[PDB]
Design a protein around this nucleic acid. Structure first.
Ligand SMILES: Nc1ncnc2c1ncn2[C@@H]1O[C@H](COP(=O)(O)OP(=O)(O)OP(=O)(O)O)[C@@H](O)[C@H]1O
Ligand SMILES: Nc1ncnc2c1ncn2[C@@H]1O[C@H](COP(=O)(O)OP(=O)(O)O)[C@@H](O)[C@H]1O
Ligand SMILES: [Mg+2]
Lengths: 247, 247
DNA sequence: AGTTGGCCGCAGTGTTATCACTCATGGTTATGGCAGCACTGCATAATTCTCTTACTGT
């Protein structure tokens, strides 16, 4: 017949959702006499919707972001120190065009990691590749790669992502070898793609964190050449939620 | 014949209890006209019960508890400051789903480790894995593993168990540089599995014990977010309670 | 009569001087292969579970 061949060809072209909604839209046109152009537009637009939904799901899976949290889930009133203007301007992704390294600083529990993850979710929803990693894990993987001789591979894997996120930078101390391993990534991404970083220590302490003042200075210079910092302060939201649960 | 073949097949299928009791079960089903399905169900249920008993035995063996205790041997009249009902509620193991952390704080000998091990035993009974360790011991083992280079193995060993019983947090103080191991364990188990902590040092002394203020602050911020803290006020049972009640 | 050794004769090798040829490098243009990314499958290694074994002293 004809329907079977249509379905088979759609599957061979990998457009099954198109075929399904194509029957629905064919019925719709039979009911309202839609032009062939608009009909095909419905088919292809819905196929695009499904394909991009699946692609964004698999991309979030590709990225190691801990959770799929959106800015909508966040409250600004509980954190007076932040301003919606700057956060939403970052959400506009102008930094990607300008290649600005976003940095978050402040004591624990403020929510800097939450905001960074939300920004990453927006970036990965808009097609841009994203990759999440912790400083300690990044350094460990780089050292193992250097040991195995595949250092270039991991360096590419950490540099290729359009938006690289480094988290928990400062709580754990780093040795000079780790300092140079981090410096390699920083240099490769000096002016090629933005870096989103979160930390609790001031810039000066990075010398003690990395075990070398000069390496810390160089990395800070390269990171801050094009950067927008967010020095946030306030009460730990974990503690406040615990208090609310108590009451 | 058939009896010997049945015994051999039960042993080859790893059904020892079934091999032992199949004759008696057959006789009982004979004398009561039990259906074949119910006969099979009886055999399988007995085998399952015995297997679960042996599994619980193995889990309690691997728990590495110093000894075995339960709430049965606990007197709440000697500890009237804290509510009895809350501990009974904990015995329902509702905290395992919520991933909340259970903290016992009080003077030495007031029964902290007793209650912690009792709750761990209740968790082991219902199949949940549990690992008992002393905080300083855990940090030392993690340091040795890191020196040997295979740190991730021990980290998984400590993070995988559903219930972690970290005791004697303040008893001993290792080199402050090793507190990052404790932070790693607490953060990796954060929002994943409960932690049972028991110690006699206030929350302010953590910076001194670990030799780092911000590190201890972050550890507590994560360990106290989802938790139920019990503060035990009293005197050393073994000496003071007997001395004051024999009068 | 046969085999080996010595002598003679013939051929091959070494050094010096000279000649010839081939290979390498530089510049420009074109083509092919390899590398990178994404998805799927298999195998190996590591981890977990269960049972048995080992060590020391009474
Ligand atoms: N203003 C807020 N409104 C709602 N949730 C908040 C707010 N601030 C923080 N949180 C919540 O606090 C939790 C922890 O946030 P986050 O991990 O970003 O903290 P942090 O300060 O970066 O921590 P650390 O220094 O330990 O890495 C998240 O669940 C986030 O949702
Ligand atoms: N409320 C109590 N009821 C029964 N026994 C108790 C109680 N408190 C303490 N004990 C006894 O004391 C010991 C527990 O002390 P523990 O809490 O381990 O002290 P620490 O926490 O300093 O190690 C156990 O042997 C237990 O039998
Ligand atoms: Mg964070």
């Amino acid at each position: 017949n004809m329907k079977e061949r249509i379905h088979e060809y759609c599957h061979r072209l990998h457009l099954p959702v198109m075929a399904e909604r194509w029957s629905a839209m064919a019925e719709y046109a039979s009911t309202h006499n839609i032009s062939y152009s608009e009909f095909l537009f419905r088919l292809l637009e819905a196929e695009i919707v499904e394909k991009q939904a699946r692609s964004i799901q698999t991309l979030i899976k590709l990225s190691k972001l801990p959770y799929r949290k959106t800015i909508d889930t966040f409250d600004f009133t509980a954190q007076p120190s932040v301003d919606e203007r700057r956060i939403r301007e970052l959400l506009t992704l102008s930094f990607i065009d300008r290649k600005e390294n976003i940095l978050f600083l402040g004591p624990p529990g403020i929510g800097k990691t939450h905001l960074a993850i939300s920004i990453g979710m927006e970036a990965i929803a808009r097609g841009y590749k994203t990759y999440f990693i912790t400083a300690h894990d990044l350094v460990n993987q780089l050292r193992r790669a250097d040991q195995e001789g595949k250092l270039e591979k991991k360096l590419r894997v950490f540099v290729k992502p359009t938006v690289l996120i480094i988290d928990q930078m400062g709580y754990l101390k780093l040795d000079p070898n780790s300092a140079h391993y981090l410096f390699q990534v920083i240099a490769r991404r000096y002016e090629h793609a933005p870096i989103i970083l979160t930390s609790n220590k001031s810039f000066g302490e990075w010398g003690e964190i990395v075990g070398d003042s000069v390496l810390a200075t160089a990395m800070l210079d390269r990171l801050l050449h094009h950067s927008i910092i967010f020095n946030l302060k306030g009460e730990s939201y974990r503690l406040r939620e615990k208090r609310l649960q108590e009451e």
